[PDB]
Amino acid sequence: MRGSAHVVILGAGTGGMPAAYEMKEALGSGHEVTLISANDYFQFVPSNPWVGVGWKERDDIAFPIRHYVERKGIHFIAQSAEQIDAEAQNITLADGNTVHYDYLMIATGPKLAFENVPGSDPHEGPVQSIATVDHAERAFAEYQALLREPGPIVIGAMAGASCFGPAYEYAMIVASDLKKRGMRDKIPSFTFITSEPYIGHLGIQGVGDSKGILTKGLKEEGIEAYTNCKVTKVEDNKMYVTQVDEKGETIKEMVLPVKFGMMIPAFKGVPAVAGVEGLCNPGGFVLVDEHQRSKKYANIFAAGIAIAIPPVETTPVPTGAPKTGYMIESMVSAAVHNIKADLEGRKGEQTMGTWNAVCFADMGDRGAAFIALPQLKPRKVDVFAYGRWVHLAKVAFEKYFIRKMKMGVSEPFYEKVLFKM
Amino acid sequence: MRGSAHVVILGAGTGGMPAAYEMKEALGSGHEVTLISANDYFQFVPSNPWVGVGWKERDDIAFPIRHYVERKGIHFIAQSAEQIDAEAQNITLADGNTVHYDYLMIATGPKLAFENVPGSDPHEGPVQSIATVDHAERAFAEYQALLREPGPIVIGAMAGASCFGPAYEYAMIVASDLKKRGMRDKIPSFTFITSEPYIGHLGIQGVGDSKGILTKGLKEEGIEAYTNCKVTKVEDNKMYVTQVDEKGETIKEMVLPVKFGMMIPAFKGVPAVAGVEGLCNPGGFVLVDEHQRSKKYANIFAAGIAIAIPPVETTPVPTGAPKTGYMIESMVSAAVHNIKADLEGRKGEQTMGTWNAVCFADMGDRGAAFIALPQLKPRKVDVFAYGRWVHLAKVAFEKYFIRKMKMGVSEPFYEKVLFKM
Ligand SMILES: Cc1cc2nc3c(=O)[nH]c(=O)nc-3n(C[C@H](O)[C@H](O)[C@H](O)COP(=O)(O)OP(=O)(O)OC[C@H]3O[C@@H](n4cnc5c(N)ncnc54)[C@H](O)[C@@H]3O)c2cc1C
Ligand SMILES: Cc1cc2nc3c(=O)[nH]c(=O)nc-3n(C[C@H](O)[C@H](O)[C@H](O)COP(=O)(O)OP(=O)(O)OC[C@H]3O[C@@H](n4cnc5c(N)ncnc54)[C@H](O)[C@@H]3O)c2cc1C
Ligand SMILES: CCCCCCCCCCCCO[C@@H]1O[C@H](CO)[C@@H](O[C@H]2O[C@H](CO)[C@@H](O)[C@H](O)[C@H]2O)[C@H](O)[C@H]1O
Ligand SMILES: CCCCCCCCCCCCO[C@@H]1O[C@H](CO)[C@@H](O[C@H]2O[C@H](CO)[C@@H](O)[C@H](O)[C@H]2O)[C@H](O)[C@H]1O
Ligand SMILES: [S]
Ligand SMILES: [S]
């Protein structure tokens, strides 16, 4: 309301959860902060691959949101938004109730676009997903079915994917786990299929020696690797693959039988957001400026996977660049700062800062990680690392991030770089 | 004097130069700041290898100090200190003049301990040095003499060395340059001799895949590599080498003829500092606390290579861990903060922070770099990188650091990490 702006945060995930705390922290007792999300629990996404192979339980990586935000003065609605009216500034919920806002911060993350590939939905065939804890549990179930009836494995990433790391992670740990069970030799063929123009492209034109190291890794595990692929359909438990050359001409087509599979899908914007007229690009990604403000509605901001980021490269098979945790946080932080400024007269000048990608993968006893910035080469930082220390660091971060989500954040979040002082 | 403390900074190098500016900045007009150094010019040390091979000129990496510090209110004495009396707080200069201090900050860097190896002094035989611009010019001169009369090459690092990177750098660029001159095939043998227990140990038990990558690098260039070596003497243009096993037993001895050589010497403390009673360890390194204060004299601080840092490992052939630029700056910064605190009543609580090593090497079109912290494994950061971008970064830093030394620093120096914002 007037003089007491009501701020809604849509989506309680990696960006949304912290955004809620920071927003409330920033605005204080004179403003209403409401968090709205499809699920009543928070889940630590980077842990889902491990759940997918049964190295982690839901209980380790997920928890109920309500108590933790409410004790901080945040209102929590565990309901999916079906409709957003940007003129009337009304959000229509699944149960039909409506919620008005003065400022809206969209943090809805990605829609998993299984529809791009008929048959690829995890409820439709053998190709599974590790994107969400629900999916990863399903993935693990099918993994156990494979153990009882060994057959071909196919892991990888679809056309239009942007999140490649987890596919490599999943493939490696699956291999690892098979060995641990003494089952690796019952698998007729283990194939890796990706839309990347080469192995270790990672949707960022490679980082450090990701190419050489991921190539050798797949080779060590007896995993056959195909690049420049798009899957045309999944049907009769077979994956129909089309492989192109640099100029997009077909050089071959394959039919791969799948007893067990996991392909990272392309991400689009969620429907309630994509459905807002003039808000998004054709992908359903919110078009925003450097301050995280919608280019169409001054009182709508966006952060995380939900926002549009221009491509810098056009690959033979469509691929996207990933939006990762540190950058998402900078986005969240900027948006909170600029909304608070709006509430106080000034235009917020705060930006997301320099584009970057940071990723950590844990193979069990050792991890791989990378840092690349800015987006185009030559970079200021372009580094790939591997070792037991990267594993120790993943462990540390999950433990830290989860605690922070229970305890609340103020907060210039990443002061965990204080390990220098 | 009383109420107007006189602060002397001894040594105008990587730590000393910034320390002078920061000290003056911190203390302002009410205090006298005096910089004292053996040379009247500043030199950018990491560039010396390139001078050693003639890829850089003295004029590119060195400049006269006086004008730049004096315009900032700093007094400059281009004179070497021969003697420090810590009781009377008097410094005796080369020309016999004496300078009193209320606080002394020692930044004298390393004494190059050629005396450990008879014949190894660059004025005594074929084994040269790239530690200083004077030495690197001499190194390059002998390099040209080798070109006129091709013979055996021997590059590497002595027993007790702590600065290994530059030896690898020098060996690589020498190889490179020989190829460019079409001379590489006139060289009878190119040998790399090091006290490291293995290639790419770097006095830090390795970082990332420094081992594999440096091993392959030397191999690519046709350079034969021996580890666990100590040189017993240089004589009749031959290098006498002794190689031990894990338990320090001799496994072989070699006599290597040298037409052209460069071995990084062991570093000790400079004599005027080592000569202060009870100030240093047997190496001549100033024993200080976490606040950079001498354990023996409350009004003496130290930073840079000059300070003592405990070993964490004992190698078959003695070796030391390097003290590098970022950590030196943290040391300088802490000391300035704590002296200013002293001048104002309180004990300064500021410390150097977490131990770390950062190094950059440029091979011409591409560079290698590393970051390791903290000192012992498993580390929080353990990374090795290579690429054209590392070369671009070295170039950038030299240009930046040199400008900063001419313009003055305040300054929480490393805000050049703002490339994130
Ligand atoms: C498997 C996996 C591994 C990853 N690993 C890394 C990594 O190691 N490091 C890293 O930096 N990045 C990682 N990423 C990338 C990225 O950090 C994550 O995808 C991250 O969770 C993105 O955060 P977000 O806030 O944009 O979206 P999300 O975390 O997905 O949050 C979106 C939220 O909005 C909710 N929502 C969606 N629609 C509605 C609606 N209509 N109404 C109400 N609520 C809705 C969702 O339920 C969800 O809670 C990983 C991604 C995946 C998929
Ligand atoms: C060849 C080389 C390459 C290097 N490369 C890197 C790298 O890439 N990155 C990095 O982080 N580190 C690098 N290092 C390590 C380290 O950063 C440098 O050695 C650095 O210069 C150390 O700074 P310092 O202030 O301790 O000593 P110095 O820079 O050596 O300064 C000591 C100063 O004190 C003066 N002095 C000594 N005795 C007296 C006296 N008695 N009276 C008056 N003045 C005196 C000297 O003339 C000199 O000016 C390199 C080192 C070397 C030798
Ligand atoms: C800073 C202190 C460290 C030591 C100082 C200098 C030591 C000399 C370095 C020698 C390296 C030479 O060898 C070089 O190594 C890297 C391997 O990682 C290779 O590079 C490889 O990984 C990089 C990523 O980092 C990729 O960009 C590249 O496509 C790939 O081939 C080069 O093909 C090889 O030429
Ligand atoms: C974070 C996103 C990136 C992708 C996600 C996961 C991809 C899978 C990673 C597969 C790597 C497997 O292969 C592994 O690679 C590194 C090579 O650099 C090797 O490790 C080598 O370099 C490292 C340093 O980084 C040294 O510690 C090691 O002694 C050396 O052998 C391992 O011997 C090899 O087992
Ligand atoms: S991702
Ligand atoms: S060094």
Short mmCIF file of C-alpha atoms in Angstrom, two decimals, chain A residues 326 353-354 356 373 378-385 388-389 392 419-421, chain B residues 326 353-354 356 373 378-385 388-389 392 419-421:
data_model
loop_
_atom_site.label_atom_id
_atom_site.label_comp_id
_atom_site.label_asym_id
_atom_site.label_seq_id
_atom_site.Cartn_x
_atom_site.Cartn_y
_atom_site.Cartn_z
CA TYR A 326 27.42 -16.41 -7.50
CA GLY A 353 28.44 -6.72 -12.08
CA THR A 354 30.66 -8.69 -14.45
CA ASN A 356 30.66 -15.02 -14.69
CA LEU A 373 34.84 -14.32 -16.45
CA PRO A 378 39.99 -13.62 -23.86
CA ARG A 379 38.87 -13.82 -20.23
CA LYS A 380 40.26 -12.15 -17.11
CA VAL A 381 39.80 -15.45 -15.29
CA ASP A 382 39.61 -18.82 -16.99
CA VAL A 383 40.32 -21.68 -14.66
CA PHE A 384 39.58 -25.37 -14.24
CA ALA A 385 40.53 -27.35 -11.15
CA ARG A 388 40.09 -33.84 -3.25
CA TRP A 389 40.03 -30.17 -2.12
CA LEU A 392 35.89 -30.78 0.42
CA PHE A 419 38.91 -17.05 4.22
CA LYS A 420 41.68 -14.69 3.07
CA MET A 421 41.74 -12.39 6.13
CA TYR B 326 49.86 -10.51 -2.61
CA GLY B 353 45.84 -13.02 7.06
CA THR B 354 45.90 -16.51 5.56
CA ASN B 356 49.13 -17.94 0.31
CA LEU B 373 46.10 -21.37 0.12
CA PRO B 378 44.28 -30.07 1.87
CA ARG B 379 43.98 -26.47 0.64
CA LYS B 380 40.95 -24.21 0.31
CA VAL B 381 42.32 -23.08 -3.05
CA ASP B 382 44.75 -25.07 -5.15
CA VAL B 383 44.79 -24.00 -8.75
CA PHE B 384 47.06 -24.00 -11.78
CA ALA B 385 46.20 -22.24 -15.02
CA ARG B 388 46.99 -16.59 -23.52
CA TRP B 389 44.82 -14.90 -20.85
CA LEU B 392 47.51 -10.81 -20.92
CA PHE B 419 36.93 -6.44 -11.91
CA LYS B 420 33.97 -8.34 -10.43
CA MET B 421 31.70 -5.34 -9.73
#
